[PDB]
Symmetry: C3
Subunit: 430 residues, 3 copies
Amino acid sequence: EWKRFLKNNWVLLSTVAAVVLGITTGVLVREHRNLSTLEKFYFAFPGEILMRMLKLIILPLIISSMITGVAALDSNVSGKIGVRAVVYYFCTTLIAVILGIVLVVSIKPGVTQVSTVDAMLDLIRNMFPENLVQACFQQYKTKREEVKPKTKEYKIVGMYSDGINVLGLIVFCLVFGLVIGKMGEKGQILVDFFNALSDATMKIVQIIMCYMPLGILFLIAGKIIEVEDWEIFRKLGLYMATVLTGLAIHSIVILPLIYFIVVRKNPFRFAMGMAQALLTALMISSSSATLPVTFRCAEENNQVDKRITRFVLPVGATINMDGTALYEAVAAVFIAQLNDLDLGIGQIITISITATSASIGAAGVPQAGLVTMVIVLSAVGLPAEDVTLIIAVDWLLDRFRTMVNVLGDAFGTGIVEKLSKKELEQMDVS
Amino acid sequence: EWKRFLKNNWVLLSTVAAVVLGITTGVLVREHRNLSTLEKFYFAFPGEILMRMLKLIILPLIISSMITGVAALDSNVSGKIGVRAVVYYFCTTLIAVILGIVLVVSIKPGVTQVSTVDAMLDLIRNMFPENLVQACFQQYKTKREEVKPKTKEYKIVGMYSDGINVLGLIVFCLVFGLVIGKMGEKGQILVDFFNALSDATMKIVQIIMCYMPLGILFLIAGKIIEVEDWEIFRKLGLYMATVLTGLAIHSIVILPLIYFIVVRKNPFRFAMGMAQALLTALMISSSSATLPVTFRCAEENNQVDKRITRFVLPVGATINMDGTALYEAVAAVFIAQLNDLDLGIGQIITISITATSASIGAAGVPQAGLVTMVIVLSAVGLPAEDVTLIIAVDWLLDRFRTMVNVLGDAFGTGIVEKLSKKELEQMDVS
Amino acid sequence: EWKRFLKNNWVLLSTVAAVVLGITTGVLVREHRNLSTLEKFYFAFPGEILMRMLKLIILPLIISSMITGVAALDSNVSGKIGVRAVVYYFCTTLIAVILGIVLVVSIKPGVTQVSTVDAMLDLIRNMFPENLVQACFQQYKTKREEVKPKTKEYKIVGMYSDGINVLGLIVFCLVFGLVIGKMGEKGQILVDFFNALSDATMKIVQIIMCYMPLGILFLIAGKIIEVEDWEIFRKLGLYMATVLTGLAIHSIVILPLIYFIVVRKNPFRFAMGMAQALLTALMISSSSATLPVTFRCAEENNQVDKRITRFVLPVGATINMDGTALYEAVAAVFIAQLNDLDLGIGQIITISITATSASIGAAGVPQAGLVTMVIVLSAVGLPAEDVTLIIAVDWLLDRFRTMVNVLGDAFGTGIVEKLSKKELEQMDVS
Ligand SMILES: CC(C)CCC[C@@H](C)[C@H]1CC[C@H]2[C@@H]3CC=C4C[C@@H](OC(=O)CCC(=O)O)CC[C@]4(C)[C@H]3CC[C@]12C
Ligand SMILES: CC(C)CCC[C@@H](C)[C@H]1CC[C@H]2[C@@H]3CC=C4C[C@@H](OC(=O)CCC(=O)O)CC[C@]4(C)[C@H]3CC[C@]12C
Ligand SMILES: CC(C)CCC[C@@H](C)[C@H]1CC[C@H]2[C@@H]3CC=C4C[C@@H](OC(=O)CCC(=O)O)CC[C@]4(C)[C@H]3CC[C@]12C
Ligand SMILES: N[C@H](C(=O)O)[C@H](OCc1cccc(NC(=O)c2ccc(C(F)(F)F)cc2)c1)C(=O)O
Ligand SMILES: N[C@H](C(=O)O)[C@H](OCc1cccc(NC(=O)c2ccc(C(F)(F)F)cc2)c1)C(=O)O
Ligand SMILES: N[C@H](C(=O)O)[C@H](OCc1cccc(NC(=O)c2ccc(C(F)(F)F)cc2)c1)C(=O)O
């Protein structure tokens, strides 16, 4: 049993092997030959091809996947027992993103030891672009300049700068998906077309992630060829500390507080019954294959009605990801702080909207998480190549992210139980 | 019976209420606080968001709606009794547009009391763009410059300026719609795809028109905050006079003359039999819901064969709109004259082609008339925000436009009767 | 029998009539009136409209036709007897393109009697664009510049210059076609959509080629209005000599050598049995209507198993075109040499990749060959209007190109016979 193991375990092993081979070839190149500025650009060329292929695919991905995500979510949601679960999912994902932003701008890993009305108005001017083909490559930006023919007079001009407009595409695909989902039968050809387009785009994302380790080997080798002071590793350690304390105070202080103020019962006697599901979600690292274990730990080990467990858990296994959203907020602001750049408050809200609204179009392919980390890095215009310093860390944080996703939608079945106590008697009587 | 009335009547009431609340808040703001140049730009911001949302939707609208319009018109047209009706519709729509252009450049409302070969050649260079994705945001423009190493030597250069190319998209969607309509069975998937895309785009146009009154309230308030001399209201009165005399000499002098030179019978004894249909089209303001009344006033109150009435009236209720085309020509040249701008003769023919060829893709949603008024304002590059001064007037001219649409296709059943007298005996004998 | 002949023969007759009427009107205009620089630009205006319409159509053509070509080729290929035919087709098409490039840069018709690493790296940077909508109009270009705060220090910058990116669209449509062809049943709506889009694009190419002779009449008239020295006709004669010697040493020296080193039998006793098929492919000038004649000349006049002839000949009649690929390579480098331009080695490999990979999406419409000659002229950014000087020659080289296409796929049935001798006994035993 040798080729079977490397058949089943090739993502984690190729990522770890690429990290260690890249670090050892960077050390063996640096302490044996000094490279100039030109040949440090030809050495990090497979990484350039990988960071081009990752940006090539995000446009049909965030069109087709967002359209089918919101159409299938509209199809699944039925009564007023399917509204409360969606509201719960999106409130806790927003709370997780806000906690991650507060923690990453308070701890500050990565820093070494004009009005704010125009940003908040360009945030709304970019949700409704003036052209829909041009939204696939250029954004808006307004600038307050001074007109002169005792007080100053001002005038606002606008210019279309380069870079994709993820907020306008997210908003238009949300509205278009709701419209073609509620059209019924006359817009079933559109749902079929965008569903097959989403499948064919997830397969190309899997092809790119088959190429990926040969790219991040050269990117890691080219990112320790300029190192001198042993100091970027402390920035990585502080980023791990920020993500782990964000998950540790999101799954202890916030979610049991939500359970206590809604249900008015003890959250820890609830969460002690989910121990098999949480240890399983740590061991197998996916929150959709630990679904039967959390089925038999909520209907049996607690006392939850199956009529709500048959809805909340299969929906929340795909669209309720608190830990991934907190991770993407913390990682985007950490990449911004690593490049000697201070974000505004239009950029923080763009990160905070693109991190929770990219949970809707979540199929079930765990590779595309990396593509989501490019999308929130490309909604605000940050250089994507520094995401290499996240991927080398990403195999040590996936376990706890899966644990917090499972804990969020396992608390959801307790939340939606108390709110919908009339409708369960209505489905019991008739 | 109170909430039922405001349920059935909410378009006219929200438009009128937005107009009067905008005028009273502009008067109450102007005579109580003086605003600078900067805070006159933040006051007209919901209007900016509305004029962005109106431009966001015109590209999938004029692609999908033109394709399904010309494909369904090709499907409906059968023999040589279905050719004459289409030729009649397009000749009278062109005559109405030409009469509107002549009247608006002769009366001139809105004015206060390089060769012309290169424009006419850019008009043909813009019907066949050199790229089809770039036609969704940029147009061509040629400039005759002078080369110098006794008579002058010249040379033509070309540059792609910004702004959508409505003429190239209209021509390509007309040819593409005819091709996939005549392909039969192998191109039925394309007709289904673009038909569902047209439905899903009309629903987003209805969503935008649900937002509209909150936008035109602030646009009207921001357009009487710069007023001083009581003079733009006289320009509005002259625009109403031009549209009403255009309809009054199109439905008295031109259409009865066409009837007299084709049929050689009295047009007024014909039109006196359509009195119930004309008063109905005034009372209910839509020319597709007054269709049974004009059915029973042409087959009964006159003497028209039903074999031509069953074709001409259901087709001409959607694609034969003379009054709307005259209105859009007069309103586009009035918006050009209001902004101290003299149009050329390439721009007048672009207005005159986009006004009659946007009657083909007419589904049956009466909101999208406003979107058509943006399209002819965006084929020639005029600022769209001044269309606010049309919308406040638009509830006083819709009745007479519906009356002239009904009168045009009611004269059509008399026209096509005399021309096709052999084919009716051929359908009677066999 | 007069109108029947001009019904069946209108492509060759309109091309020849346009050539002779254009030459006689250029001679009658030049020796009777001298034109300035400005009115030499209005005389060649229908040619400008034709060269705009030819560029308008290449984007949906190379998207939809490449997708359906590689999906249908994936569907047809079954066992290991369908792999060897595809490998044979693409190796001989590459050998033909390489022979054409060597012959055209060695003979040099058309000439009158920065690193090369950055070009070869932009060749790979253009196969994976950073945006997919922007790949429909702009390409990448890197430039090695010098940074200055004894040896020089350099730094590579990049800029997106204008012009369509045929290499990125070809690579993405190849990967997308393979993915939606191997998805099976869940991506059949995509195969149907792109198949109907390919049919509707071939019909618009036939409409443009109905317009074509009125365009090339004025282009030929405007290209002999600047002639003085009788010297461009010698360049045309040398281009004919280069294409004819390329076909003459591709169908005598290379293809019988491939047959001799694979089959180890005499190629001329094989090719003497194909005499009826070769004379037929000369007389009727299409290699897909001479298919039954080469069916009955390989299974009967030789001794080829029908189980391989029923696969190799219907596939190789559409995707195996050696003579057309050699012609397009020679013609693109000849158009480059005619405009006083020396190609690099990124541009020669772009021509050499776009010439063999545009044989995959080959439906069966013989007009679109001209559109392929624009595509390889637009992957490297050459002025397309000089393709007029190819079209006037193109009716004298089509016969021999059809002969070499038929000879290539007729040698293929002898090649694939010897390689697959085990599988034929496996299909005979069971
Ligand atoms: C840092 C901590 C203290 C933040 C606490 C946040 C809470 C105040 C939020 C988060 C989850 C929210 C709940 C999530 C879901 C719902 C269901 C929602 O929908 C319905 O019950 C009605 C649906 C219908 O019938 O239309 C009403 C609000 C409510 C109870 C929310 C009330 C406010 C809650 C408890
Ligand atoms: C300002 C006023 C005086 C303008 C007058 C315009 C008329 C001269 C036009 C407008 C309507 C036209 C008619 C509209 C429709 C048709 C049908 C059309 O098609 C057919 O009858 C033949 C169809 C076929 O069999 O192919 C022929 C032209 C005709 C009579 C047109 C002839 C010219 C008309 C009368
Ligand atoms: C200028 C001249 C001398 C160039 C000569 C070129 C040859 C060396 C090339 C061209 C055609 C090639 C052949 C084309 C097709 C095939 C089938 C190909 O596929 C298989 O037989 C295996 C398929 C499988 O089972 O997977 C193996 C290589 C081979 C024999 C190629 C071997 C190399 C050949 C003979
Ligand atoms: N393993 C965790 C756990 O199972 O919840 C967690 O899973 C992340 C995950 C799992 C499955 C699918 C996805 N997301 C997607 O496939 C995806 C695809 C497309 C988009 C889009 F928005 F369209 F760009 C966004 C997301 C993410 C993690 O790794 O952080
Ligand atoms: N009420 C009048 C009466 O019933 O004829 C008359 O109706 C205008 C009307 C009625 C119904 C539909 C439409 N037009 C559309 O929906 C439309 C939709 C799309 C386009 C496109 F060209 F594609 F942009 C053009 C028009 C216009 C008017 O209000 O002037
Ligand atoms: N007559 C020859 C003989 O029959 O092989 C030979 O035929 C060329 C021919 C014949 C049939 C179809 C095609 N090509 C196409 O239709 C085509 C269509 C699209 C593309 C694309 F790549 F998508 F742009 C490429 C090619 C070419 C020739 O004329 O040189």
